[PDB]
Amino acid sequence: GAMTIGRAKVYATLSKIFYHLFYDEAIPKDCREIIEKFGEIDFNLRSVLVRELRGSVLIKDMPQSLAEVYESVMKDFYERYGFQASELHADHIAVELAFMSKLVEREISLAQQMKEEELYKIRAAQHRFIKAHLQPLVKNLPSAPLLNFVRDFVREDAKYLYSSL
């Protein structure tokens, strides 16, 4: 219901914002206003910074052996749920957020089709994805209003999923 729709919207909206910042494009006012519903916020992050918000870059504790194959690790997870990374490295924050929005969009339908077992499985996949990939990425973000918002959202979403599981 309402919760699932909302989660999908936040993930999709954050993803789109990072894609625009990546290419040094203005954020559509439609996207801004969505995040501005939470209140006023600064959307000014340098494209040079945004381009490098990748898991294998931000996570300094990542072993070189893992960082060298991390794209394939990400793509293996994505392919399992029929997702393909658009344009950017598979471990880029924008792509990871887009993948979450897609998992949550599938959850919306499964909840209303009342498919209990598949609903548990999709939520379990979301939590697995956050624990393995997205949360480690976001915990290593530098401090900025947009990035802190993403931190807060992902932290609270994983708690939500853990409790629902």
JSON list of C-alpha atoms in Angstrom, two decimals:
[
{"chain": "A", "resi": 1, "resn": "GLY", "atom": "CA", "xyz": [0.00, 0.00, 0.00]},
{"chain": "A", "resi": 2, "resn": "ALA", "atom": "CA", "xyz": [0.95, 3.61, 0.79]},
{"chain": "A", "resi": 3, "resn": "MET", "atom": "CA", "xyz": [4.25, 2.68, 2.45]},
{"chain": "A", "resi": 4, "resn": "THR", "atom": "CA", "xyz": [5.52, 0.61, -0.49]},
{"chain": "A", "resi": 5, "resn": "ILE", "atom": "CA", "xyz": [4.54, 3.27, -3.06]},
{"chain": "A", "resi": 6, "resn": "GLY", "atom": "CA", "xyz": [6.35, 5.90, -0.98]},
{"chain": "A", "resi": 7, "resn": "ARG", "atom": "CA", "xyz": [9.55, 3.86, -0.66]},
{"chain": "A", "resi": 8, "resn": "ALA", "atom": "CA", "xyz": [9.66, 3.28, -4.42]},
{"chain": "A", "resi": 9, "resn": "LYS", "atom": "CA", "xyz": [9.15, 7.00, -5.08]},
{"chain": "A", "resi": 10, "resn": "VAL", "atom": "CA", "xyz": [12.01, 8.06, -2.75]},
{"chain": "A", "resi": 11, "resn": "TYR", "atom": "CA", "xyz": [14.42, 5.52, -4.29]},
{"chain": "A", "resi": 12, "resn": "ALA", "atom": "CA", "xyz": [13.43, 6.52, -7.89]},
{"chain": "A", "resi": 13, "resn": "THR", "atom": "CA", "xyz": [13.61, 10.24, -7.10]},
{"chain": "A", "resi": 14, "resn": "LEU", "atom": "CA", "xyz": [17.05, 10.01, -5.42]},
{"chain": "A", "resi": 15, "resn": "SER", "atom": "CA", "xyz": [18.32, 7.90, -8.34]},
{"chain": "A", "resi": 16, "resn": "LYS", "atom": "CA", "xyz": [17.12, 10.45, -10.94]},
{"chain": "A", "resi": 17, "resn": "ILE", "atom": "CA", "xyz": [18.69, 13.32, -8.96]},
{"chain": "A", "resi": 18, "resn": "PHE", "atom": "CA", "xyz": [22.10, 11.62, -8.92]},
{"chain": "A", "resi": 19, "resn": "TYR", "atom": "CA", "xyz": [21.89, 10.87, -12.69]},
{"chain": "A", "resi": 20, "resn": "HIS", "atom": "CA", "xyz": [21.32, 14.56, -13.42]},
{"chain": "A", "resi": 21, "resn": "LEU", "atom": "CA", "xyz": [24.15, 15.62, -11.08]},
{"chain": "A", "resi": 22, "resn": "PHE", "atom": "CA", "xyz": [26.41, 13.02, -12.71]},
{"chain": "A", "resi": 23, "resn": "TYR", "atom": "CA", "xyz": [26.06, 14.69, -16.12]},
{"chain": "A", "resi": 24, "resn": "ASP", "atom": "CA", "xyz": [26.12, 18.20, -14.60]},
{"chain": "A", "resi": 25, "resn": "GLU", "atom": "CA", "xyz": [22.46, 18.78, -15.60]},
{"chain": "A", "resi": 26, "resn": "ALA", "atom": "CA", "xyz": [19.89, 20.86, -13.71]},
{"chain": "A", "resi": 27, "resn": "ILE", "atom": "CA", "xyz": [17.58, 18.82, -11.53]},
{"chain": "A", "resi": 28, "resn": "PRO", "atom": "CA", "xyz": [14.04, 18.98, -12.96]},
{"chain": "A", "resi": 29, "resn": "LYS", "atom": "CA", "xyz": [11.93, 21.06, -10.55]},
{"chain": "A", "resi": 30, "resn": "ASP", "atom": "CA", "xyz": [9.55, 18.09, -10.33]},
{"chain": "A", "resi": 31, "resn": "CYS", "atom": "CA", "xyz": [12.36, 16.02, -8.74]},
{"chain": "A", "resi": 32, "resn": "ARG", "atom": "CA", "xyz": [13.47, 18.85, -6.47]},
{"chain": "A", "resi": 33, "resn": "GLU", "atom": "CA", "xyz": [9.93, 19.58, -5.21]},
{"chain": "A", "resi": 34, "resn": "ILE", "atom": "CA", "xyz": [9.56, 15.90, -4.24]},
{"chain": "A", "resi": 35, "resn": "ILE", "atom": "CA", "xyz": [12.68, 16.04, -2.03]},
{"chain": "A", "resi": 36, "resn": "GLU", "atom": "CA", "xyz": [11.71, 19.61, -1.01]},
{"chain": "A", "resi": 37, "resn": "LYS", "atom": "CA", "xyz": [8.49, 18.12, 0.44]},
{"chain": "A", "resi": 38, "resn": "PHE", "atom": "CA", "xyz": [10.74, 17.02, 3.33]},
{"chain": "A", "resi": 39, "resn": "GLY", "atom": "CA", "xyz": [11.84, 20.65, 3.51]},
{"chain": "A", "resi": 40, "resn": "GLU", "atom": "CA", "xyz": [14.36, 23.00, 1.93]},
{"chain": "A", "resi": 41, "resn": "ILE", "atom": "CA", "xyz": [17.66, 21.40, 0.86]},
{"chain": "A", "resi": 42, "resn": "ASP", "atom": "CA", "xyz": [20.76, 22.15, -1.25]},
{"chain": "A", "resi": 43, "resn": "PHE", "atom": "CA", "xyz": [21.06, 20.17, -4.50]},
{"chain": "A", "resi": 44, "resn": "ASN", "atom": "CA", "xyz": [24.46, 21.62, -5.43]},
{"chain": "A", "resi": 45, "resn": "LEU", "atom": "CA", "xyz": [26.95, 18.75, -5.61]},
{"chain": "A", "resi": 46, "resn": "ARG", "atom": "CA", "xyz": [29.80, 18.98, -8.14]},
{"chain": "A", "resi": 47, "resn": "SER", "atom": "CA", "xyz": [29.53, 16.52, -11.04]},
{"chain": "A", "resi": 48, "resn": "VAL", "atom": "CA", "xyz": [33.21, 15.61, -10.43]},
{"chain": "A", "resi": 49, "resn": "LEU", "atom": "CA", "xyz": [32.27, 14.46, -6.90]},
{"chain": "A", "resi": 50, "resn": "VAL", "atom": "CA", "xyz": [29.03, 12.69, -7.92]},
{"chain": "A", "resi": 51, "resn": "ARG", "atom": "CA", "xyz": [30.77, 10.71, -10.71]},
{"chain": "A", "resi": 52, "resn": "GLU", "atom": "CA", "xyz": [32.99, 9.06, -8.08]},
{"chain": "A", "resi": 53, "resn": "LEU", "atom": "CA", "xyz": [30.22, 7.99, -5.68]},
{"chain": "A", "resi": 54, "resn": "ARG", "atom": "CA", "xyz": [30.81, 4.31, -6.42]},
{"chain": "A", "resi": 55, "resn": "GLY", "atom": "CA", "xyz": [30.95, 1.42, -3.90]},
{"chain": "A", "resi": 56, "resn": "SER", "atom": "CA", "xyz": [34.44, 0.28, -4.99]},
{"chain": "A", "resi": 57, "resn": "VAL", "atom": "CA", "xyz": [35.72, 3.87, -4.67]},
{"chain": "A", "resi": 58, "resn": "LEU", "atom": "CA", "xyz": [34.02, 5.01, -1.44]},
{"chain": "A", "resi": 59, "resn": "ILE", "atom": "CA", "xyz": [34.63, 1.81, 0.54]},
{"chain": "A", "resi": 60, "resn": "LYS", "atom": "CA", "xyz": [38.35, 2.08, 1.35]},
{"chain": "A", "resi": 61, "resn": "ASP", "atom": "CA", "xyz": [38.22, -1.16, 3.40]},
{"chain": "A", "resi": 62, "resn": "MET", "atom": "CA", "xyz": [37.36, -3.07, 0.20]},
{"chain": "A", "resi": 63, "resn": "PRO", "atom": "CA", "xyz": [40.16, -5.47, -0.78]},
{"chain": "A", "resi": 64, "resn": "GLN", "atom": "CA", "xyz": [41.71, -4.80, -4.19]},
{"chain": "A", "resi": 65, "resn": "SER", "atom": "CA", "xyz": [40.73, -8.32, -5.31]},
{"chain": "A", "resi": 66, "resn": "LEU", "atom": "CA", "xyz": [37.06, -7.52, -4.65]},
{"chain": "A", "resi": 67, "resn": "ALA", "atom": "CA", "xyz": [37.18, -3.99, -6.09]},
{"chain": "A", "resi": 68, "resn": "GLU", "atom": "CA", "xyz": [38.57, -5.39, -9.36]},
{"chain": "A", "resi": 69, "resn": "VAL", "atom": "CA", "xyz": [35.54, -7.69, -9.82]},
{"chain": "A", "resi": 70, "resn": "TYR", "atom": "CA", "xyz": [32.92, -5.61, -7.96]},
{"chain": "A", "resi": 71, "resn": "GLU", "atom": "CA", "xyz": [31.07, -4.58, -11.15]},
{"chain": "A", "resi": 72, "resn": "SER", "atom": "CA", "xyz": [30.47, -8.25, -11.98]},
{"chain": "A", "resi": 73, "resn": "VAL", "atom": "CA", "xyz": [29.35, -8.89, -8.37]},
{"chain": "A", "resi": 74, "resn": "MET", "atom": "CA", "xyz": [26.80, -6.06, -8.70]},
{"chain": "A", "resi": 75, "resn": "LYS", "atom": "CA", "xyz": [25.62, -7.24, -12.15]},
{"chain": "A", "resi": 76, "resn": "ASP", "atom": "CA", "xyz": [25.16, -10.81, -10.91]},
{"chain": "A", "resi": 77, "resn": "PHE", "atom": "CA", "xyz": [22.71, -9.49, -8.26]},
{"chain": "A", "resi": 78, "resn": "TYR", "atom": "CA", "xyz": [20.95, -7.19, -10.76]},
{"chain": "A", "resi": 79, "resn": "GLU", "atom": "CA", "xyz": [20.59, -9.92, -13.44]},
{"chain": "A", "resi": 80, "resn": "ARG", "atom": "CA", "xyz": [18.95, -12.23, -10.88]},
{"chain": "A", "resi": 81, "resn": "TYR", "atom": "CA", "xyz": [16.05, -9.72, -10.73]},
{"chain": "A", "resi": 82, "resn": "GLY", "atom": "CA", "xyz": [16.09, -8.67, -14.40]},
{"chain": "A", "resi": 83, "resn": "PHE", "atom": "CA", "xyz": [17.79, -5.31, -13.89]},
{"chain": "A", "resi": 84, "resn": "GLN", "atom": "CA", "xyz": [20.51, -3.89, -16.11]},
{"chain": "A", "resi": 85, "resn": "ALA", "atom": "CA", "xyz": [22.58, -0.88, -15.09]},
{"chain": "A", "resi": 86, "resn": "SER", "atom": "CA", "xyz": [21.85, 2.14, -17.30]},
{"chain": "A", "resi": 87, "resn": "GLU", "atom": "CA", "xyz": [24.87, 4.16, -18.51]},
{"chain": "A", "resi": 88, "resn": "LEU", "atom": "CA", "xyz": [26.95, 4.26, -15.28]},
{"chain": "A", "resi": 89, "resn": "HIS", "atom": "CA", "xyz": [29.20, 1.79, -13.42]},
{"chain": "A", "resi": 90, "resn": "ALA", "atom": "CA", "xyz": [27.11, -0.89, -11.75]},
{"chain": "A", "resi": 91, "resn": "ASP", "atom": "CA", "xyz": [28.35, 0.13, -8.28]},
{"chain": "A", "resi": 92, "resn": "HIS", "atom": "CA", "xyz": [27.44, 3.80, -8.74]},
{"chain": "A", "resi": 93, "resn": "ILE", "atom": "CA", "xyz": [25.00, 5.11, -6.08]},
{"chain": "A", "resi": 94, "resn": "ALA", "atom": "CA", "xyz": [22.49, 6.21, -8.80]},
{"chain": "A", "resi": 95, "resn": "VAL", "atom": "CA", "xyz": [22.34, 2.65, -10.19]},
{"chain": "A", "resi": 96, "resn": "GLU", "atom": "CA", "xyz": [22.07, 0.99, -6.76]},
{"chain": "A", "resi": 97, "resn": "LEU", "atom": "CA", "xyz": [19.20, 3.34, -5.88]},
{"chain": "A", "resi": 98, "resn": "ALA", "atom": "CA", "xyz": [17.50, 2.63, -9.24]},
{"chain": "A", "resi": 99, "resn": "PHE", "atom": "CA", "xyz": [17.78, -1.10, -8.57]},
{"chain": "A", "resi": 100, "resn": "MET", "atom": "CA", "xyz": [16.14, -0.63, -5.13]},
{"chain": "A", "resi": 101, "resn": "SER", "atom": "CA", "xyz": [13.29, 1.34, -6.73]},
{"chain": "A", "resi": 102, "resn": "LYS", "atom": "CA", "xyz": [12.71, -1.59, -9.12]},
{"chain": "A", "resi": 103, "resn": "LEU", "atom": "CA", "xyz": [12.69, -4.20, -6.34]},
{"chain": "A", "resi": 104, "resn": "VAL", "atom": "CA", "xyz": [10.21, -2.05, -4.39]},
{"chain": "A", "resi": 105, "resn": "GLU", "atom": "CA", "xyz": [8.02, -1.47, -7.47]},
{"chain": "A", "resi": 106, "resn": "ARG", "atom": "CA", "xyz": [7.78, -5.28, -7.84]},
{"chain": "A", "resi": 107, "resn": "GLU", "atom": "CA", "xyz": [6.87, -5.45, -4.13]},
{"chain": "A", "resi": 108, "resn": "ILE", "atom": "CA", "xyz": [3.89, -3.10, -4.71]},
{"chain": "A", "resi": 109, "resn": "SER", "atom": "CA", "xyz": [2.24, -5.57, -7.11]},
{"chain": "A", "resi": 110, "resn": "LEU", "atom": "CA", "xyz": [3.08, -8.70, -5.08]},
{"chain": "A", "resi": 111, "resn": "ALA", "atom": "CA", "xyz": [1.52, -7.18, -1.95]},
{"chain": "A", "resi": 112, "resn": "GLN", "atom": "CA", "xyz": [-1.76, -6.47, -3.79]},
{"chain": "A", "resi": 113, "resn": "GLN", "atom": "CA", "xyz": [-1.74, -9.84, -5.58]},
{"chain": "A", "resi": 114, "resn": "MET", "atom": "CA", "xyz": [-1.49, -11.11, -1.97]},
{"chain": "A", "resi": 115, "resn": "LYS", "atom": "CA", "xyz": [1.44, -13.37, -2.92]},
{"chain": "A", "resi": 116, "resn": "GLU", "atom": "CA", "xyz": [2.78, -14.02, 0.59]},
{"chain": "A", "resi": 117, "resn": "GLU", "atom": "CA", "xyz": [5.84, -16.15, -0.22]},
{"chain": "A", "resi": 118, "resn": "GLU", "atom": "CA", "xyz": [7.11, -14.01, -3.12]},
{"chain": "A", "resi": 119, "resn": "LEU", "atom": "CA", "xyz": [6.51, -10.84, -1.07]},
{"chain": "A", "resi": 120, "resn": "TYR", "atom": "CA", "xyz": [8.74, -12.16, 1.71]},
{"chain": "A", "resi": 121, "resn": "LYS", "atom": "CA", "xyz": [11.35, -13.17, -0.89]},
{"chain": "A", "resi": 122, "resn": "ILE", "atom": "CA", "xyz": [11.44, -9.75, -2.57]},
{"chain": "A", "resi": 123, "resn": "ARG", "atom": "CA", "xyz": [11.77, -7.97, 0.79]},
{"chain": "A", "resi": 124, "resn": "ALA", "atom": "CA", "xyz": [14.50, -10.40, 1.79]},
{"chain": "A", "resi": 125, "resn": "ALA", "atom": "CA", "xyz": [16.36, -9.58, -1.46]},
{"chain": "A", "resi": 126, "resn": "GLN", "atom": "CA", "xyz": [16.06, -5.84, -0.72]},
{"chain": "A", "resi": 127, "resn": "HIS", "atom": "CA", "xyz": [17.54, -6.28, 2.73]},
{"chain": "A", "resi": 128, "resn": "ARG", "atom": "CA", "xyz": [20.32, -8.50, 1.41]},
{"chain": "A", "resi": 129, "resn": "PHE", "atom": "CA", "xyz": [21.10, -5.85, -1.22]},
{"chain": "A", "resi": 130, "resn": "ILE", "atom": "CA", "xyz": [21.18, -3.01, 1.35]},
{"chain": "A", "resi": 131, "resn": "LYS", "atom": "CA", "xyz": [23.39, -4.99, 3.78]},
{"chain": "A", "resi": 132, "resn": "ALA", "atom": "CA", "xyz": [25.87, -6.14, 1.12]},
{"chain": "A", "resi": 133, "resn": "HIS", "atom": "CA", "xyz": [26.06, -3.09, -1.15]},
{"chain": "A", "resi": 134, "resn": "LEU", "atom": "CA", "xyz": [24.03, 0.06, -0.61]},
{"chain": "A", "resi": 135, "resn": "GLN", "atom": "CA", "xyz": [24.49, 0.59, 3.11]},
{"chain": "A", "resi": 136, "resn": "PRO", "atom": "CA", "xyz": [28.30, 0.11, 2.94]},
{"chain": "A", "resi": 137, "resn": "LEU", "atom": "CA", "xyz": [28.35, 2.66, 0.09]},
{"chain": "A", "resi": 138, "resn": "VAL", "atom": "CA", "xyz": [26.21, 5.24, 1.86]},
{"chain": "A", "resi": 139, "resn": "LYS", "atom": "CA", "xyz": [28.05, 4.88, 5.20]},
{"chain": "A", "resi": 140, "resn": "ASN", "atom": "CA", "xyz": [31.19, 6.03, 3.34]},
{"chain": "A", "resi": 141, "resn": "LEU", "atom": "CA", "xyz": [29.66, 9.16, 1.79]},
{"chain": "A", "resi": 142, "resn": "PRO", "atom": "CA", "xyz": [31.20, 12.56, 2.54]},
{"chain": "A", "resi": 143, "resn": "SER", "atom": "CA", "xyz": [28.98, 15.04, 4.46]},
{"chain": "A", "resi": 144, "resn": "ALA", "atom": "CA", "xyz": [26.53, 17.12, 2.41]},
{"chain": "A", "resi": 145, "resn": "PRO", "atom": "CA", "xyz": [22.77, 17.83, 2.74]},
{"chain": "A", "resi": 146, "resn": "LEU", "atom": "CA", "xyz": [21.73, 15.49, -0.11]},
{"chain": "A", "resi": 147, "resn": "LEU", "atom": "CA", "xyz": [24.17, 12.74, 0.93]},
{"chain": "A", "resi": 148, "resn": "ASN", "atom": "CA", "xyz": [23.12, 12.89, 4.59]},
{"chain": "A", "resi": 149, "resn": "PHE", "atom": "CA", "xyz": [19.47, 12.58, 3.50]},
{"chain": "A", "resi": 150, "resn": "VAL", "atom": "CA", "xyz": [20.38, 9.40, 1.58]},
{"chain": "A", "resi": 151, "resn": "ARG", "atom": "CA", "xyz": [22.22, 8.06, 4.66]},
{"chain": "A", "resi": 152, "resn": "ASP", "atom": "CA", "xyz": [19.20, 8.73, 6.88]},
{"chain": "A", "resi": 153, "resn": "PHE", "atom": "CA", "xyz": [16.78, 7.18, 4.38]},
{"chain": "A", "resi": 154, "resn": "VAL", "atom": "CA", "xyz": [18.79, 3.98, 3.74]},
{"chain": "A", "resi": 155, "resn": "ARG", "atom": "CA", "xyz": [19.46, 3.49, 7.48]},
{"chain": "A", "resi": 156, "resn": "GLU", "atom": "CA", "xyz": [15.73, 3.81, 8.30]},
{"chain": "A", "resi": 157, "resn": "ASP", "atom": "CA", "xyz": [14.68, 1.66, 5.31]},
{"chain": "A", "resi": 158, "resn": "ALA", "atom": "CA", "xyz": [16.91, -1.27, 6.34]},
{"chain": "A", "resi": 159, "resn": "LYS", "atom": "CA", "xyz": [15.40, -1.13, 9.85]},
{"chain": "A", "resi": 160, "resn": "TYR", "atom": "CA", "xyz": [11.92, -1.14, 8.26]},
{"chain": "A", "resi": 161, "resn": "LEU", "atom": "CA", "xyz": [12.78, -4.20, 6.13]},
{"chain": "A", "resi": 162, "resn": "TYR", "atom": "CA", "xyz": [14.48, -6.02, 9.04]},
{"chain": "A", "resi": 163, "resn": "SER", "atom": "CA", "xyz": [11.35, -5.50, 11.20]},
{"chain": "A", "resi": 164, "resn": "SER", "atom": "CA", "xyz": [9.06, -6.64, 8.36]},
{"chain": "A", "resi": 165, "resn": "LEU", "atom": "CA", "xyz": [11.17, -9.79, 7.94]}
]
